[PDB]
């Protein structure tokens, strides 16, 4: 057979450097291109944290700002019970995915919360391109779909239940543009930026 092409060899990953780490899949849900090397403020932080009661957590820049400022300031029992039998794998998956993956940049411009996808994660194999053109085969175990959260200044749910109620009339079409003009419950990026510019002016 003539050699008019580039026959790059394919090799598998050894099993010795597969234990104690897992190679998941990252997927955004947006109409525009998302790039952590350009569109994200370095350093980026992706942790399996709780999404419960969001918009009340400060980002890593304000965390290290608070650390710096506090460093400156300081210096009959039931005998038997029923046990429902359950499979070990689904219990481990539920315990792992009780908290979702949340990735935020340094200033909180892009906060993405990932959701586990169980569709065809077992049939996904990643072919990574090496420096010499070779291909390395990686078994992908889990697929996560990430949706941007608190990007357009979303509102809380306690006020929303009032808006479902018929005690209030028709919901105005530009109600929370007025709230954005007021400056209450904005995105995490602006909330961190206000404190960042307040500390820097001192």
């Amino acid at each position: 057979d003539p050699n008019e092409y580039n026959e790059f060899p394919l090799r598998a990953i050894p099993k010795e450097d597969l234990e104690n780490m897992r190679t998941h899949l990252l997927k955004f849900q947006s109409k525009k291109k998302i790039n952590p090397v350009t569109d994200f403020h370095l350093p980026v932080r992706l942790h399996r944290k709780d999404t419960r009661n969001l918009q009340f957590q400060l980002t890593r820049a304000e965390i290290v700002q608070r650390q710096k400022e506090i460093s400156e300031y300081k210096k009959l029992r039931r005998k038997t019970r029923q046990l429902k039998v359950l499979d070990e794998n689904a219990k481990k998956l539920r315990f792992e995915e009780f908290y979702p993956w949340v990735m935020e940049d340094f200033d909180g411009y892009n906060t993405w919360v990932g959701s586990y996808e169980a569709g065809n994660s077992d049939s996904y194999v990643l072919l990574s391109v090496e420096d010499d053109g070779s291909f390395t085969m990686i078994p992908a175990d889990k697929v996560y779909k990430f949706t941007a959260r608190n990007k357009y200044a979303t509102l809380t749910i306690d006020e929303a239940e009032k808006r479902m109620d018929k005690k209030s009339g028709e919901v105005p079409r530009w109600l929370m543009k007025h709230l954005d003009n007021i400056g209450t419950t904005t995105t995490r990026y602006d909330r961190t930026r206000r404190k960042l510019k307040a500390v820097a002016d001192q």
Partner: protein, 116 residues
């Protein structure tokens, strides 16, 4: 009516009155996205409907064995063989006019003589 969605957060746009130009501009309620309306029509409601009568026409509509075949003349390619069906909208007051699909060029032509 051609519903349009925001290019940033993929939510649908709504018309806004502006006093600076007095033009029709579509505004996103979520991320304050502005774009210019390509048509002054913002809402349309039909009481009698002519779309959905040819619903279900696909590239292999002739593969259906239950569809009746006719020998009518296709006025695009002059083929005798074709399938036909009635109006697919299930209104009680719809007409019994036949729609014919040619199996050679996939052309829709009706048996309506009032329209023709």
């Amino acid at each position: 009516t051609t519903f349009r969605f925001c290019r940033d957060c993929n939510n649908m746009l709504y018309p806004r009155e502006d006093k600076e130009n007095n033009r029709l501009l579509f505004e996103c309620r979520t991320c304050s996205y502005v774009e210019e309306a390509g048509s002054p029509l913002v809402y349309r409601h039909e009481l009698i409907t002519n779309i959905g009568e040819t619903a279900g026409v696909v590239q292999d509509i002739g593969s259906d064995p239950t569809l009746p075949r006719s020998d009518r003349e296709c006025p695009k390619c002059h083929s005798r063989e074709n399938v036909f069906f009635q109006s697919q909208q299930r209104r009680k007051d719809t007409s019994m006019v036949l729609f014919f699909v040619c199996l050679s060029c996939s052309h829709i032509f009706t048996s309506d003589q009032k329209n023709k």
